[PDB]
PDB file of C-alpha atoms in Angstrom:
ATOM      1  CA  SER A   1      18.552 107.046  61.826  1.00 37.57           C
ATOM      2  CA  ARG A   2      17.944 110.912  62.013  1.00 38.30           C
ATOM      3  CA  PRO A   3      14.586 112.263  63.199  1.00 40.40           C
ATOM      4  CA  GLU A   4      11.526 111.329  61.366  1.00 41.65           C
ATOM      5  CA  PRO A   5       9.875 114.170  59.639  1.00 41.33           C
ATOM      6  CA  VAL A   6       6.406 115.611  60.863  1.00 41.22           C
ATOM      7  CA  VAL A   7       4.173 115.795  57.767  1.00 41.01           C
ATOM      8  CA  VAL A   8       1.273 118.154  57.305  1.00 39.29           C
ATOM      9  CA  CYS A   9      -1.291 118.240  54.435  1.00 38.29           C
ATOM     10  CA  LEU A  10      -3.362 121.255  53.900  1.00 37.86           C
ATOM     11  CA  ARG A  11      -6.063 120.772  51.607  1.00 35.61           C
ATOM     12  CA  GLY A  12      -9.281 122.603  50.541  1.00 35.91           C
ATOM     13  CA  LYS A  13     -10.887 124.716  47.868  1.00 36.45           C
ATOM     14  CA  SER A  14      -8.801 126.882  45.597  1.00 37.65           C
ATOM     15  CA  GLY A  15      -7.747 130.370  46.926  1.00 37.14           C
ATOM     16  CA  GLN A  16      -9.460 129.698  50.314  1.00 35.88           C
ATOM     17  CA  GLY A  17      -6.506 129.727  52.516  1.00 37.31           C
ATOM     18  CA  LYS A  18      -4.471 126.461  52.176  1.00 39.46           C
ATOM     19  CA  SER A  19      -1.608 128.103  50.187  1.00 39.75           C
ATOM     20  CA  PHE A  20      -1.195 131.030  52.520  1.00 38.93           C
ATOM     21  CA  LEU A  21      -1.600 128.804  55.585  1.00 37.79           C
ATOM     22  CA  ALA A  22       1.310 126.525  54.232  1.00 38.86           C
ATOM     23  CA  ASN A  23       3.625 129.515  53.819  1.00 36.87           C
ATOM     24  CA  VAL A  24       2.692 130.856  57.320  1.00 36.03           C
ATOM     25  CA  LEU A  25       3.166 127.472  58.952  1.00 31.24           C
ATOM     26  CA  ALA A  26       6.520 126.970  57.172  1.00 31.97           C
ATOM     27  CA  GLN A  27       7.976 130.171  58.276  1.00 33.00           C
ATOM     28  CA  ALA A  28       6.542 129.903  61.654  1.00 32.43           C
ATOM     29  CA  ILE A  29       8.235 126.491  62.201  1.00 32.05           C
ATOM     30  CA  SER A  30      11.520 127.686  60.652  1.00 30.18           C
ATOM     31  CA  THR A  31      11.436 130.690  63.031  1.00 28.67           C
ATOM     32  CA  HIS A  32      10.846 128.481  66.142  1.00 29.07           C
ATOM     33  CA  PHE A  33      13.642 126.019  65.472  1.00 28.47           C
ATOM     34  CA  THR A  34      16.243 128.362  63.544  1.00 31.90           C
ATOM     35  CA  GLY A  35      15.338 131.707  64.975  1.00 32.33           C
ATOM     36  CA  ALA A  36      14.325 133.025  61.393  1.00 32.57           C
ATOM     37  CA  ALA A  37      11.836 132.437  58.715  1.00 29.03           C
ATOM     38  CA  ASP A  38      14.233 131.387  55.879  1.00 28.92           C
ATOM     39  CA  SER A  39      14.988 127.731  56.681  1.00 27.75           C
ATOM     40  CA  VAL A  40      12.385 126.692  54.139  1.00 24.52           C
ATOM     41  CA  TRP A  41      12.928 124.725  50.903  1.00 30.32           C
ATOM     42  CA  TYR A  42      10.255 124.744  48.322  1.00 30.27           C
ATOM     43  CA  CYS A  43      10.153 121.624  46.271  1.00 30.49           C
ATOM     44  CA  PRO A  44      10.408 122.834  42.531  1.00 31.95           C
ATOM     45  CA  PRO A  45       8.232 121.437  39.707  1.00 27.85           C
ATOM     46  CA  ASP A  46      11.009 118.872  38.742  1.00 32.50           C
ATOM     47  CA  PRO A  47      12.777 117.493  41.673  1.00 32.09           C
ATOM     48  CA  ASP A  48      15.929 116.837  39.308  1.00 33.03           C
ATOM     49  CA  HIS A  49      18.729 117.561  41.610  1.00 34.33           C
ATOM     50  CA  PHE A  50      17.214 119.125  44.715  1.00 33.65           C
ATOM     51  CA  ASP A  51      18.880 122.348  43.883  1.00 34.18           C
ATOM     52  CA  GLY A  52      19.466 124.514  47.191  1.00 33.25           C
ATOM     53  CA  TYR A  53      18.366 121.852  49.587  1.00 33.94           C
ATOM     54  CA  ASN A  54      20.498 122.254  52.683  1.00 33.94           C
ATOM     55  CA  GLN A  55      18.848 120.199  55.416  1.00 33.19           C
ATOM     56  CA  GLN A  56      16.281 123.176  55.831  1.00 34.65           C
ATOM     57  CA  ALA A  57      13.966 123.044  58.818  1.00 35.49           C
ATOM     58  CA  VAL A  58      10.797 122.913  56.503  1.00 37.81           C
ATOM     59  CA  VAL A  59      10.093 121.435  53.180  1.00 34.91           C
ATOM     60  CA  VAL A  60       7.180 122.792  51.251  1.00 36.43           C
ATOM     61  CA  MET A  61       5.516 120.820  48.380  1.00 33.94           C
ATOM     62  CA  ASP A  62       2.801 122.764  46.409  1.00 32.45           C
ATOM     63  CA  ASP A  63      -0.247 121.041  44.984  1.00 32.52           C
ATOM     64  CA  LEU A  64       0.863 117.577  45.750  1.00 35.50           C
ATOM     65  CA  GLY A  65      -0.666 115.093  43.480  1.00 36.74           C
ATOM     66  CA  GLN A  66      -1.672 117.293  40.561  1.00 37.82           C
ATOM     67  CA  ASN A  67       0.814 116.344  37.900  1.00 38.88           C
ATOM     68  CA  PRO A  68      -0.418 113.053  36.435  1.00 36.87           C
ATOM     69  CA  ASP A  69       3.163 111.833  35.649  1.00 35.80           C
ATOM     70  CA  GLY A  70       3.711 111.899  39.592  1.00 37.27           C
ATOM     71  CA  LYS A  71       7.223 112.826  40.120  1.00 36.09           C
ATOM     72  CA  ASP A  72       6.049 114.604  43.318  1.00 31.93           C
ATOM     73  CA  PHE A  73       4.593 111.480  44.960  1.00 31.81           C
ATOM     74  CA  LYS A  74       7.752 109.581  44.402  1.00 30.27           C
ATOM     75  CA  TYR A  75      10.083 111.836  46.163  1.00 35.89           C
ATOM     76  CA  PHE A  76       7.592 112.733  48.891  1.00 39.76           C
ATOM     77  CA  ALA A  77       7.223 108.955  49.465  1.00 39.67           C
ATOM     78  CA  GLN A  78      10.966 108.621  49.882  1.00 38.66           C
ATOM     79  CA  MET A  79      11.197 111.577  52.272  1.00 39.95           C
ATOM     80  CA  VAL A  80       8.805 109.823  54.547  1.00 37.57           C
ATOM     81  CA  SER A  81      10.573 106.476  53.798  1.00 37.12           C
ATOM     82  CA  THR A  82      11.494 103.992  56.575  1.00 38.79           C
ATOM     83  CA  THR A  83      15.166 103.963  55.111  1.00 40.87           C
ATOM     84  CA  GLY A  84      17.172 107.363  55.006  1.00 39.08           C
ATOM     85  CA  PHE A  85      16.456 109.013  51.656  1.00 40.51           C
ATOM     86  CA  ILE A  86      19.538 110.459  50.011  1.00 36.74           C
ATOM     87  CA  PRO A  87      18.262 113.243  47.742  1.00 38.55           C
ATOM     88  CA  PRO A  88      20.145 113.707  44.394  1.00 41.13           C
ATOM     89  CA  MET A  89      22.612 116.591  44.476  1.00 40.46           C
ATOM     90  CA  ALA A  90      24.514 118.272  41.667  1.00 41.17           C
ATOM     91  CA  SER A  91      27.941 118.812  43.102  1.00 43.02           C
ATOM     92  CA  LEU A  92      30.237 115.996  44.512  1.00 42.94           C
ATOM     93  CA  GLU A  93      30.498 118.125  47.688  1.00 44.48           C
ATOM     94  CA  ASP A  94      26.846 117.754  48.542  1.00 46.49           C
ATOM     95  CA  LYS A  95      26.206 114.025  47.245  1.00 46.90           C
ATOM     96  CA  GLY A  96      25.471 111.505  49.795  1.00 44.62           C
ATOM     97  CA  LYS A  97      24.118 114.121  52.333  1.00 45.37           C
ATOM     98  CA  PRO A  98      20.969 112.736  53.940  1.00 43.88           C
ATOM     99  CA  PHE A  99      17.596 114.297  53.616  1.00 43.73           C
ATOM    100  CA  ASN A 100      17.057 115.774  57.142  1.00 43.55           C
ATOM    101  CA  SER A 101      14.147 118.368  57.592  1.00 41.84           C
ATOM    102  CA  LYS A 102      11.931 118.604  60.545  1.00 40.54           C
ATOM    103  CA  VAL A 103       8.565 119.240  58.944  1.00 38.65           C
ATOM    104  CA  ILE A 104       7.196 118.448  55.325  1.00 37.72           C
ATOM    105  CA  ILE A 105       4.100 120.545  54.394  1.00 37.59           C
ATOM    106  CA  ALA A 106       2.096 119.743  51.489  1.00 40.66           C
ATOM    107  CA  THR A 107      -0.732 121.550  49.887  1.00 40.16           C
ATOM    108  CA  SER A 108      -3.153 119.402  47.963  1.00 42.02           C
ATOM    109  CA  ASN A 109      -6.433 119.802  45.874  1.00 42.10           C
ATOM    110  CA  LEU A 110      -7.191 116.312  46.226  1.00 44.35           C
ATOM    111  CA  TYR A 111     -10.457 115.161  47.853  1.00 42.81           C
ATOM    112  CA  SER A 112     -10.332 112.953  50.891  1.00 43.71           C
ATOM    113  CA  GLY A 113     -13.304 110.891  51.663  1.00 43.65           C
ATOM    114  CA  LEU A 114      -0.491 107.748  51.527  1.00 42.75           C
ATOM    115  CA  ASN A 115      -2.857 109.673  53.586  1.00 45.11           C
ATOM    116  CA  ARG A 116      -1.675 107.577  56.340  1.00 49.84           C
ATOM    117  CA  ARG A 117       1.671 109.234  56.145  1.00 51.22           C
ATOM    118  CA  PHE A 118       0.262 112.673  57.248  1.00 55.52           C
ATOM    119  CA  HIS A 119       0.478 113.438  61.016  1.00 55.94           C
ATOM    120  CA  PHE A 120      -1.790 116.591  60.324  1.00 55.47           C
ATOM    121  CA  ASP A 121      -4.448 116.478  57.473  1.00 53.72           C
ATOM    122  CA  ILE A 122      -6.457 119.646  57.530  1.00 56.35           C
ATOM    123  CA  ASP A 123      -9.011 121.001  55.152  1.00 53.75           C
ATOM    124  CA  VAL A 124      -8.896 124.822  54.947  1.00 54.39           C
ATOM    125  CA  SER A 125     -11.872 126.900  53.799  1.00 55.68           C
ATOM    126  CA  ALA A 126     -12.836 130.564  54.091  1.00 57.22           C
ATOM    127  CA  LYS A 127     -15.470 131.645  56.704  1.00 54.94           C
ATOM    128  CA  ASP A 128     -18.473 133.837  55.466  1.00 51.71           C
ATOM    129  CA  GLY A 129     -17.262 137.174  56.855  1.00 52.04           C
ATOM    130  CA  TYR A 130     -13.969 136.737  54.922  1.00 55.99           C
ATOM    131  CA  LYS A 131     -15.190 135.296  51.596  1.00 55.03           C
ATOM    132  CA  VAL A 132     -15.380 137.397  48.393  1.00 55.59           C
ATOM    133  CA  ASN A 133     -16.332 135.643  45.104  1.00 52.88           C
ATOM    134  CA  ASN A 134     -15.605 132.058  46.520  1.00 53.54           C
ATOM    135  CA  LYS A 135     -12.058 133.054  47.663  1.00 53.84           C
ATOM    136  CA  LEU A 136     -10.613 134.198  50.891  1.00 49.31           C
ATOM    137  CA  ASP A 137     -10.600 137.904  51.350  1.00 46.39           C
ATOM    138  CA  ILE A 138      -6.906 137.926  52.338  1.00 47.69           C
ATOM    139  CA  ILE A 139      -6.761 141.840  52.793  1.00 46.44           C
ATOM    140  CA  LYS A 140      -9.512 141.686  55.385  1.00 48.16           C
ATOM    141  CA  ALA A 141      -7.992 138.452  56.952  1.00 46.74           C
ATOM    142  CA  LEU A 142      -4.580 140.090  57.364  1.00 45.38           C
ATOM    143  CA  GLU A 143      -6.154 143.301  58.924  1.00 45.09           C
ATOM    144  CA  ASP A 144      -4.549 143.928  62.270  1.00 44.82           C
ATOM    145  CA  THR A 145      -6.971 143.438  65.267  1.00 44.34           C
ATOM    146  CA  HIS A 146      -4.593 145.196  67.709  1.00 43.53           C
ATOM    147  CA  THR A 147      -4.855 142.258  69.899  1.00 40.57           C
ATOM    148  CA  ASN A 148      -1.637 141.173  71.859  1.00 42.89           C
ATOM    149  CA  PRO A 149       0.584 139.160  69.355  1.00 38.65           C
ATOM    150  CA  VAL A 150       1.326 135.582  69.895  1.00 39.05           C
ATOM    151  CA  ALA A 151       4.646 133.814  69.883  1.00 36.33           C
ATOM    152  CA  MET A 152       6.849 134.653  66.790  1.00 35.89           C
ATOM    153  CA  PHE A 153       3.948 136.592  65.051  1.00 36.89           C
ATOM    154  CA  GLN A 154       4.286 140.231  64.937  1.00 37.18           C
ATOM    155  CA  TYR A 155       0.613 140.947  65.165  1.00 34.65           C
ATOM    156  CA  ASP A 156      -2.712 139.229  65.350  1.00 35.33           C
ATOM    157  CA  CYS A 157      -5.225 139.001  62.473  1.00 36.52           C
ATOM    158  CA  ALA A 158      -8.178 136.829  61.469  1.00 34.46           C
ATOM    159  CA  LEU A 159      -5.966 134.625  59.263  1.00 35.70           C
ATOM    160  CA  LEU A 160      -4.094 133.540  62.150  1.00 33.04           C
ATOM    161  CA  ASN A 161      -6.771 133.635  65.061  1.00 33.45           C
ATOM    162  CA  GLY A 162      -9.333 131.428  63.443  1.00 37.06           C
ATOM    163  CA  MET A 163     -11.842 134.039  62.529  1.00 38.21           C
ATOM    164  CA  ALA A 164     -11.092 134.096  58.703  1.00 40.37           C
ATOM    165  CA  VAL A 165     -10.450 130.596  57.912  1.00 43.58           C
ATOM    166  CA  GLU A 166     -12.025 127.277  59.014  1.00 45.97           C
ATOM    167  CA  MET A 167      -9.709 124.313  59.847  1.00 49.03           C
ATOM    168  CA  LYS A 168     -11.279 120.795  59.685  1.00 47.87           C
ATOM    169  CA  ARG A 169      -8.972 118.095  60.821  1.00 49.15           C
ATOM    170  CA  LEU A 170      -9.295 114.831  58.814  1.00 52.64           C
ATOM    171  CA  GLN A 171      -8.999 111.900  61.122  1.00 56.85           C
ATOM    172  CA  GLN A 172      -7.579 108.552  60.566  1.00 56.07           C
ATOM    173  CA  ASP A 173      -9.488 106.548  63.538  1.00 55.30           C
ATOM    174  CA  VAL A 174     -13.298 107.124  64.221  1.00 53.00           C
ATOM    175  CA  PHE A 175     -13.509 106.686  67.972  1.00 51.89           C
ATOM    176  CA  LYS A 176      -9.966 107.357  68.813  1.00 53.66           C
ATOM    177  CA  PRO A 177     -10.196 110.946  67.546  1.00 52.67           C
ATOM    178  CA  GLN A 178      -7.248 113.165  67.557  1.00 50.09           C
ATOM    179  CA  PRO A 179      -8.378 116.608  68.920  1.00 51.56           C
ATOM    180  CA  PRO A 180      -9.443 119.472  66.669  1.00 52.20           C
ATOM    181  CA  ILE A 181      -7.062 121.979  65.394  1.00 53.45           C
ATOM    182  CA  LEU A 182      -8.874 125.377  65.083  1.00 52.93           C
ATOM    183  CA  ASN A 183      -6.420 128.083  64.175  1.00 50.96           C
ATOM    184  CA  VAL A 184      -2.920 128.714  63.039  1.00 52.73           C
ATOM    185  CA  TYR A 185      -1.524 129.384  66.416  1.00 49.66           C
ATOM    186  CA  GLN A 186      -2.660 126.096  67.751  1.00 50.02           C
ATOM    187  CA  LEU A 187      -1.518 124.265  64.612  1.00 52.41           C
ATOM    188  CA  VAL A 188       1.855 125.757  64.911  1.00 48.14           C
ATOM    189  CA  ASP A 189       2.179 124.465  68.659  1.00 48.20           C
ATOM    190  CA  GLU A 190       0.995 121.139  67.813  1.00 50.36           C
ATOM    191  CA  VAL A 191       3.637 120.669  65.047  1.00 52.22           C
ATOM    192  CA  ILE A 192       6.262 122.082  67.275  1.00 54.13           C
ATOM    193  CA  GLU A 193       5.374 119.714  69.932  1.00 52.65           C
ATOM    194  CA  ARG A 194       5.474 116.660  67.629  1.00 54.53           C
ATOM    195  CA  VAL A 195       8.640 117.691  66.224  1.00 54.28           C
ATOM    196  CA  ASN A 196      10.099 117.976  69.653  1.00 55.67           C
ATOM    197  CA  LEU A 197       9.136 114.306  70.417  1.00 56.89           C
ATOM    198  CA  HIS A 198      10.522 113.088  67.160  1.00 55.21           C
ATOM    199  CA  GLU A 199      13.725 114.734  67.857  1.00 55.58           C
ATOM    200  CA  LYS A 200      13.909 113.638  71.647  1.00 56.04           C
ATOM    201  CA  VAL A 201      13.268 110.052  70.657  1.00 56.40           C
ATOM    202  CA  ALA A 202      15.996 110.100  68.070  1.00 56.31           C
ATOM    203  CA  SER A 203      18.566 112.022  70.258  1.00 57.24           C
ATOM    204  CA  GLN A 204      17.941 110.664  73.648  1.00 56.85           C
ATOM    205  CA  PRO A 205      19.778 107.187  74.045  1.00 53.88           C
ATOM    206  CA  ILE A 206      18.283 104.211  75.523  1.00 55.21           C
ATOM    207  CA  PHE A 207      21.928 103.174  76.343  1.00 58.80           C
ATOM    208  CA  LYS A 208      24.806 105.146  77.538  1.00 56.95           C
ATOM    209  CA  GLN A 209      26.743 106.421  74.473  1.00 59.39           C
TER     210      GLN A 209
END
């Protein structure tokens, strides 16, 4: 019915970037499609009634798969359902409103040797020049390079341009490999391009309507 969501998984070692990149990507995508960074809904620990969900551009799910009881997988599975997920809402006014977000971004601490539902699956690690006691040195990674800024980003820094963090795209096929994704700027453009495709196939009719 509505556009199929584009799904991004960012995984890797604790505190080596995946969470920071989740938040940067979410706000970047929100900004491209709505003009501002606030069309982001963060899935709460207990997806009881989807409080505050309003068809935001981006849904973020933290640490997907870390609660053994597994409420998070259940709703995630529906969001990327074949049928149109209708989230539970508290007020009669909002009940029945379809789930309609452009991008779902999950962070995960899980190893990858379900996953077939991710359009982008990326391991995030800190590079040596930006690594301090086994964690990303985020202060150094956010230092302004005074390079020309890019797209919606206000300045350039190692976190965004690829010097601070290593992205390793996890691939489904073996000799049909999707191209590498090497920094945030490129990841943002790849997700935008894929959302554009999903929305065009869902809005451009085959038959005159």
